[PDB]
RNA sequence: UAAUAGAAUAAGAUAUAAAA
RNA sequence: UUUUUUUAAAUAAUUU
């Protein structure tokens, strides 16, 4: 068609549709005989399939690099001038135009530049690839956590796989970035050693969620939830939190039970959760997987602009 | 590029999008320019309006929301220093905040037109024609402003102050605001004629279409548009060729001189012709009414092999305009509705159901085209008329389609405009087929509406 | 410098000029065009602005609002032009927005019985020379006289008085100093009267003086420039050739209809000289205007 | 290395876990600025988490330029900082002080805004009178400072500065002297007055109160040059031991004045060439260009100046490129060192120069001799292809002069420049030849072209001389050009300045004559 | 405890409508 | 071929 003299330059209205990475954060992709540089040891893999989780040992992302993405982070969450493109977002918590002390979002790498180009970041796509047998890997979707200071609440115990129930294989892993330093007392991530391995790979029922109430008891509603076997290798190996610096990266199981703490420290702390799967994963009933995106029937191949492949052994 | 000043970053900006906006659309000028934006920002040093004035129009033009921080920082220099963006940095700030939609976007646009508005007697040749085009990019209704800029062409344009570009800005300029003034465009066209031949194919192809554009309604300046271009037709381009069909389709007057060497040259350069000016060839002929089944048969062919290259408009277009002359293509219209099918989520509010009524009006059904129109249907029912929804509803009670999620919508759109649904003449036929469909259980109070 | 000019009203342009005599409007206009165009074409002038027109005639007239003497911009008593007070303002309006004065010195407004016009007033070499006629009284002669009149060995201002009779024009429509050293008078009365004036207060003076024929109307900007270029009527073939054998530049202009209502060329340009502020010690860049590398070619 | 006191220390302010008030912020950004013992600087996430404590602060404890130095130390390292833009006082905490303060913190953050210097301004004149002197003065700095238009508040203060006159200083008087030439729309009658005022007190002066002296008298222009004159009879007697900046500006207000008596012009340039050595880059450029104005440049005078300049030839800022080298132009003195260290910098920032500088650089070079067999040529035709798209009438010109002088040879590049000419019109003919000059060269063009070219060199013979007419012959001769209309009109004028044909004619104009 | 300034410059199609 | 203007304007009506 003819586009006008001055909007030749401008992107399409959802950044879904755009083929590839910009180049905003580290610039372009390398090339196709450039990415055996950002290969993980072998140990690492063996510690992510020993306790359920792993951390990456360098930061994934400069200083620079962290403070725009906070900057987009903090742009998500206006509520004076909202954000455009928030139409194209899967959920939101401010749909009620108030928000509060939990600021959740998803599928926002379709609305603003950095948070798209972050998928496509090679050192964690290619962990995440060598945990999922060297296979093409799709992404999932996107998570932004955002606390406020000294009110933030937490999330309690939870699987993740508990909610990709409608999807078949168990083919999946988490990769968690922090973009604000962490610690027990905001935010840090509290995780089970050993407990992917629990149910024989199952999932364990739901826990109940009680807000308005301590720290204390959402984060020990856990012996609700598990039997005897469970509770002895609690008693073992009792739930440790991870410390986790301004660009630290976090590989988790898709089965190991996972928590959040509070946040009480003075400023609000930010974190991002990306979910990315494997080639071979079909799904169970007929239509869409998330709201408004192209619908599946039967036991059909996972595909489409809504979950692009974002790294090919080939 | 960190030894580069703001200055020096705005300089580059400019020179980046005046090469990609001109000479190609390279795309590694635009993921560098925009890489290079990413990463600048004014905070801490003292920079003139006109430097800021460059960075907000550089960054918006290639993609920068108003999310964005540097976007964030010119709209607050623009705001708390008003009376140091002058006249001549004025055009930079409102065309940036043109495609901006936000509260300090409009803020600022409101405040550049009511200054605009104040010294609309003081400004020379270049200022009168940016500051029209430039609010003419935005979509604003101030008459007032629109009437003192006039006034002012008008007294420049009677010394002679104008050139050929300036004509051409100007026409569109004025042509796109719908502001009908006939001694404007009189005047324009005089110092036109009065220009004589520093007016070229290209500078002289948009005046025509402009001045067909906003439809004067006046004989004698199009015989004189149609005389000049008579002679100009062996230099034109197909696209121009093109360009003119469409034009003197819009003014309406039947030229069969001009047609049939219209005709001959489009026929001559029947290779260079993409989808989109097949697309247009049509409609134009569609508008004007006259029947060629010569050239169609050449136009029908050429479509065939640019299959990939159709956009949803051009889909629709040639789509319509086959189905009104009543031209049967087996092959181009499954080949058609199958690419129509694979961009389902291209069309727009009308287009979608332009291209609907035009498969179905003809006996042409495809399941492929049929499941993805109805699906897509969902989310441009808001967008409708009474008529174009009738027409929807038509086409889809001819697809047979039973879904209530998709028939919810149309239903309800059209129960919220019942009045100017049932008082439409021509379409009184159509109402009583789709009540044979779907009968008097779907929607039982639509029924009671139609029974009145 | 920044030469101002209006566009003529032509609905309420004037059948018949003052004695009676014919006008033609479309002609008007087209001469109007012309001279706009000529003015364009002169290389010293760095803009012309063009304002709108307003409704009566003698609005053409913009050079009667101030005078520029030196670096003086004396705006005239408003005695006589009450009902173009406004044009007035509207024309200072345009004066500030290309960056000119903010505002115009009323020293001869405050002076009471001051009368005098723009055009009795020649900026000569080495000062002004003032006209005493009719339309200015003694009053102007001595409040100017006392404002810029400055005696010493090298900052030294000349006013000059010359004395004209009742039915002579305005003394800058025939009596002018162009080039550097010509004297361009009328070959009339008043321009021997005045020439012989100026050759006597000022004794000991050489500079040539050319005499043009009766009624050929002429501008010359003149400066330190030396800008050549004289504008000239067409009609007069003579003083064309006159102007061209002193080493000038004359530059044929159409005047038939302002002539015939009684404006001249002087009178309908408004020419000012602006500079920039240049805070802090700052020599502002200038445009050249002569021949580079002289000694190597 | 972190100890373990010192660590946890460092984890505590790390985690945001501490609160901070603007002083102590302030004082640990003053010790990290001082001392760089325990790497303060060398951690991201220790001053982002200080940034993080100072922007949840009250910064309206600390002085405003605690506050920008807070926001400079953080942007040294790398963090975007800021401070908050104060409000404007209401109700009861109206005071002078309040009011002053204000306009110090837009002052020195940076952070200007018209709305609220006209909501202060409304707030401040009825108490005008309880203003103390002093404050009076800063209040017309702090105005000059931010290019406030309201000039009638202005002159309101500087005439109740005026009825103080006894109270004020030699340094108070030159500052209100300074700030109010600095604004813009002054009346002329103040101005007359705090000038009469300056003119007196006139041995109390300092060197600095004569920098502001000068400043001002620059700034307003020759009709105060009588002001100027008792300026340089009293420096008469001091002029042997000035400052080289206050020589500096002596010369740029001589230049401006236009002042006539040259003796005390001669005194002073020789006076000023002595301690030349002393200047700065831009002083230097300045006291040559306020020398070259008042044509003083003798041998000694400009081998002086050159030979002062050649030290920061090396590094010349791009703005100081051009206008040496004009200097270096229309004075017959050797200055061939000058030149070519000139033009090697030119060449090494050649992708920095905007467009009017390199239009300006190509005209100045575009008659040089030794200029033309260099790769400035070149690289200079390669950056003004690019940048034609920039290029405004008088840039296009002088780019197109200098290198068609220089004997650069691109027919793109020609014919590229008179489309950018024929988008906007040429006013002029000395707009219109560069053009002709440059199509020349390669001797064709497209029909078109040659066809809007006559139409528009047509208008414009009625006015040229007849050096002017022959150029334009022999340009559209070269070009090629048929067109009837414009031979016709060529023809008139020079009739009329030359009447019938002779046959000592020249043969050219003879054919002229033809009309062909 | 903290205060110094320079530049003048123009790109161009959104699927509508009654009288010197 | 040419045709255009320069107020602080404040009185509609409703249960939306």
Redesign the pocket.
């Known amino acids: 068609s003819?586009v006008?003299?001055?909007l030749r330059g401008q992107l399409p209205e959802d950044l879904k549709d755009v083929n590839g990475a910009l180049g905003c954060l580290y610039g372009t992709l390398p090339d196709v005989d450039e990415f055996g540089q950002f290969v993980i040891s072998p140990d690492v893999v063996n510690s992510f399939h020993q306790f359920g989780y792993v951390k990456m040992p360098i930061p994934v992302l400069d200083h620079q690099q962290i403070d725009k993405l906070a900057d987009e982070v903090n742009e998500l969450a206006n509520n004076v001038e909202h954000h455009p493109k928030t139409e194209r977002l899967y959920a939101t918590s401010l749909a009620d135009l108030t928000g509060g002390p939990l600021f959740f979002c998803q599928g926002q790498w379709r609305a603003a530049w950095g948070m798209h180009d972050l998928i496509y970041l090679p050192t964690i796509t290619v962990a995440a690839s060598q945990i999922l047998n060297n296979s093409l890997v799709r992404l999932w979707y996107d998570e932004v956590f955002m606390k406020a200071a000294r009110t933030g609440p937490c999330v309690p115990w939870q699987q993740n796989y508990a909610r990709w129930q409608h999807t078949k294989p168990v083919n999946h892993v988490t990769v968690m970035i922090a973009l604000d330093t962490m610690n027990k007392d905001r935010g840090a991530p509290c995780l089970v050693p050993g407990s992917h391995r629990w149910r024989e790979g199952g999932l364990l029922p739901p826990v109940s969620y009680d807000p308005t109430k301590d720290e204390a008891h959402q984060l020990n509603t856990i012996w609700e939830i598990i039997n005897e076997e469970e509770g002895e290798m609690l008693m073992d190996t009792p739930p440790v939190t991870v410390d986790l610096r301004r660009g630290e990266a976090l590989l988790i199981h898709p089965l190991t039970l996972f928590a959040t703490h509070g946040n009480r420290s003075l400023d609000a702390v930010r974190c991002c959760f990306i979910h990315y799967m494997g080639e071979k994963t079909y799904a169970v009933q007929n239509g869409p997987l998330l709201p408004h995106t192209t619908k599946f029937q039967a036991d059909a191949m996972i595909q489409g602009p809504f979950y692009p492949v974002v790294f090919d052994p080939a | 590029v960190s030894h580069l000043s703001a200055?020096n970053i705005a300089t580059e900006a400019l020179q980046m999008k005046?090469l990609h906006?001109?000479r190609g659309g390279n795309p590694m000028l635009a993921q560098q320019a925009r890489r290079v934006l990413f990463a600048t920002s004014i905070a801490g040093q003292?920079l003139?309006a006109?430097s800021v004035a460059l960075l907000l129009n550089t960054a918006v033009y290639f993609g920068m929301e108003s999310d964005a921080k540097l976007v964030r920082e010119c709209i607050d220099y623009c705001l708390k220093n008003d009376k140091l963006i002058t006249v001549?940095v004025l055009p930079i700030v409102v065309?940036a905040c043109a495609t901006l939609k936000s509260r300090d976007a409009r803020e600022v646009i409101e405040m550049q037109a009511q200054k605009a508005a104040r010294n609309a007697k003081f400004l020379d040749?270049?200022d009168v024609?940016?500051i029209i085009?430039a609010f003419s990019?935005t979509?604003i209704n101030h008459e007032?402003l629109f009437?003192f800029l006039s006034?002012r062409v008008?007294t420049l344009a009677?010394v002679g102050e104008f050139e050929?570009?300036?004509l051409?800005?100007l026409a569109?300029?004025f042509?796109?605001l719908?502001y009908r003034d006939k001694?404007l465009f009189?005047?324009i066209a005089?110092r036109a004629?009065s220009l004589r031949e520093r007016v070229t194919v290209?500078?002289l192809?948009?005046l025509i279409?402009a001045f067909s554009?906003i439809?004067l309604?006046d004989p004698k300046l199009s015989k004189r548009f149609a005389t000049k271009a008579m002679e100009y037709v062996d230099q034109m381009n197909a696209?121009?060729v093109?360009?003119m069909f469409?034009a003197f389709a819009?003014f309406?007057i039947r030229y069969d001189q001009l047609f049939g060497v219209l005709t001959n040259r489009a026929v001559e350069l029947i290779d260079e012709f993409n989808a989109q000016y097949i697309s247009?060839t049509l409609?134009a002929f569609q508008r004007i009414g006259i029947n060629n089944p010569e050239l169609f048969d050449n136009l029908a062919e050429r479509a065939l092999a640019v299959v990939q290259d159709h956009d949803?408009?051009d889909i629709?277009?040639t789509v319509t305009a086959l189905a009104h002359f009543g031209l049967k293509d087996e092959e181009l219209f499954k080949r058609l509705a199958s690419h129509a099918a694979s961009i389902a989520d291209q069309f727009?509010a009308?287009?979608l159901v332009?291209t609907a009524h035009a498969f179905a009006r003809t006996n042409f059904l495809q399941q492929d085209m049929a499941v993805a129109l109805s699906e897509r249907s969902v989310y441009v029912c808001r967008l409708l008329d009474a008529g174009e929804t009738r027409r929807l509803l038509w086409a889809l009670a001819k697809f047979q389609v039973r879904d209530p999620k998709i028939l919810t919508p149309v239903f309800n759109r059209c129960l919220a405009l019942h009045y100017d649904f049932f008082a439409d003449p021509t379409g009184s036929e159509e109402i009583e087929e789709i009540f044979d469909f779907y009968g008097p259980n779907f929607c039982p109070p639509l029924y009671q509406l139609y029974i009145s | 410098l920044h030469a101002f000019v209006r566009s003529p009203?032509?609905?309420t342009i004037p059948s018949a000029g003052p004695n009676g005599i014919v006008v033609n409007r479309?002609m008007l206009?087209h001469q109007f065009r012309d001279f706009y165009k000529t003015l364009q074409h002169c290389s010293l002038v760095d803009k012309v602005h063009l304002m709108?027109?307003?409704?009566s005639v003698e609005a053409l007239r913009v050079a009667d609002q101030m005078v520029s003497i030196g670096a003086t911009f004396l705006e005239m008593p408003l005695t006589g032009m009450e009902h173009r007070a406004?044009e007035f303002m509207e024309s200072m309006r345009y004066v500030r927005g290309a960056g000119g004065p903010s505002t115009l010195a009323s020293y001869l407004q405050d002076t009471e019985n001051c009368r005098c016009n723009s055009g009795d007033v020649v900026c000569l070499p080495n000062g002004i020379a003032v006209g005493h006629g009719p339309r200015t009284n003694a009053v102007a002669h001595t409040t100017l006289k006392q404002l810029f009149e400055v005696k010493d060995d090298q900052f030294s201002f000349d006013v000059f008085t010359l004395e004209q009779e009742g039915d002579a024009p305005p003394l800058g429509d025939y009596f002018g100093f162009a080039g550097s050293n010509v004297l361009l008078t009328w070959k009339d009365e008043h321009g021997l009267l005045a020439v012989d004036q100026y050759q006597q207060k000022q004794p000991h003076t050489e500079m040539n003086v050319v005499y043009l024929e009766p009624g050929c109307h002429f501008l010359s900007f003149y400066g330190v420039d030396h800008t050549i270029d004289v504008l000239v009527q067409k009609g007069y073939e003579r003083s064309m050739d006159s102007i061209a054998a002193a080493g000038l530049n004359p530059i044929p202009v159409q005047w038939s209809e302002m002539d015939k209502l009684g404006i001249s060329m002087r009178a309908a340009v408004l020419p000012l000289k602006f500079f920039?502020a240049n805070?802090?010690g700052?020599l502002?860049?200038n445009k050249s205007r002569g021949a580079r590398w002289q000694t190597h070619q | 290395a972190r100890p373990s006191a010192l660590h946890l220390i460092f984890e505590r302010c790390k985690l945001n876990l501490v609160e901070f008030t603007a002083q102590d912020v302030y004082q640990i950004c003053?010790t990290a600025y001082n001392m760089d013992t325990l790497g303060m600087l060398q951690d991201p996430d220790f001053m982002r988490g200080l940034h993080d404590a100072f922007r949840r602060s009250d910064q309206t404890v600390i002085?405003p330029?605690?506050a920008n130095?807070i926001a400079d130390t953080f942007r040294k390292v790398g963090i975007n900082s800021m401070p908050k833009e104060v409000s404007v006082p209401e109700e009861d905490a109206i005071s002078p002080e309040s009011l002053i303060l204000v306009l110090?913190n837009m002052?020195?953050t940076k952070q200007r805004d018209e709305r609220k210097i006209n909501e202060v301004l409304k707030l401040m004149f009825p108490i005008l009178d309880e203003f103390s002197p002093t404050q009076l003065s800063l209040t017309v700095?702090?105005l000059?400072?931010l290019k406030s238009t309201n000039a009638d508040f202005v002159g309101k203060l500087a005439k109740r500065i005026m009825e103080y006159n006894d109270d004020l200083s030699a340094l108070d008087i030159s500052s209100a002297a300074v700030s109010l030439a600095?604004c813009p729309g002054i009346s002329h009658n103040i101005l007359y007055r705090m000038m009469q005022i300056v003119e007196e007190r006139m041995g109390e002066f300092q060197p600095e109160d004569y920098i502001n002296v000068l400043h001002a008298l620059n700034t307003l222009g020759p009709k105060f040059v009588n002001t100027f004159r008792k300026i340089v009879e009293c420096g008469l007697q001091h002029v042997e031991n000035m400052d080289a900046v206050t020589l500096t500006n002596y010369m740029v207000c001589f230049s401006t004045m236009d002042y006539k008596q040259r003796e005390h012009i001669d005194i002073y340039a020789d006076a000023l060439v002595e301690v030349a050595t002393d200047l700065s880059?831009?002083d230097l450029?300045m006291a040559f260009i306020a020398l070259q104005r008042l044509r003083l440049l003798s041998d000694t005078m400009f081998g002086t100046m050159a030979s002062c300049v050649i030290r920061y030839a090396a590094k010349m800022?791009?703005?100081?490129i051009a206008?040496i080298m004009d200097i270096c132009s229309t004075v017959p003195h050797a200055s061939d060192h000058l030149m070519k260290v000139l033009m090697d910098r030119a060449v090494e920032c050649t992708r920095i120069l905007?467009?009017?500088?390199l239009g300006?650089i190509l005209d100045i070079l575009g008659l040089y001799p030794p200029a033309r067999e260099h790769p400035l040529v070149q690289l200079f035709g390669k950056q003004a292809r690019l940048r034609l798209?920039?290029?405004?009438?008088?840039?296009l010109a002088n780019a197109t002069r200098g290198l068609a002088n220089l004997g650069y040879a691109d027919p793109e590049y020609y014919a590229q420049a008179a489309?950018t000419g024929f988008?906007?019109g040429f006013k002029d003919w000395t707009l219109l030849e560069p053009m002709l000059m440059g199509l020349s060269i390669t001797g064709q063009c497209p029909p078109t072209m040659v066809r809007v070219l006559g139409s528009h060199i047509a208008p414009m013979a009625r006015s040229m001389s007849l050096m002017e007419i022959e150029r334009a012959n022999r340009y559209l001769r070269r070009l090629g050009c048929e067109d009837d209309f414009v031979y016709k009109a060529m023809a008139s004028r020079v009739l009329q300045f030359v009447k019938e044909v002779t046959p000592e004619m020249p043969e050219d104009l003879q054919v002229l004559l033809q009309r062909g």
């Open positions: 003819y006008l003299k001055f | 200055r005046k906006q001109e003292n003139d006109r001549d065309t040749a270049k024609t940016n085009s990019k979509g007032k009437a006034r008008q009677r050929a570009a300036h051409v800005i569109n300029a042509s796109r719908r001694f009189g005047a005089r004629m290209n500078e192809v948009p279409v554009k439809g309604k696209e121009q093109a360009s469409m819009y309406g247009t409609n949803a408009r629709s277009k727009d009308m287009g332009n | 009203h032509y609905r479309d206009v709108s027109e307003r409704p406004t920039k805070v802090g700052m502002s860049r | 003053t002085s330029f605690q130095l110090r002052n020195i700095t702090e000059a400072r600095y880059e831009k450029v800022d791009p703005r100081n206008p905007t467009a009017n500088q300006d798209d920039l290029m405004g009438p008088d840039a489309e988008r906007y």
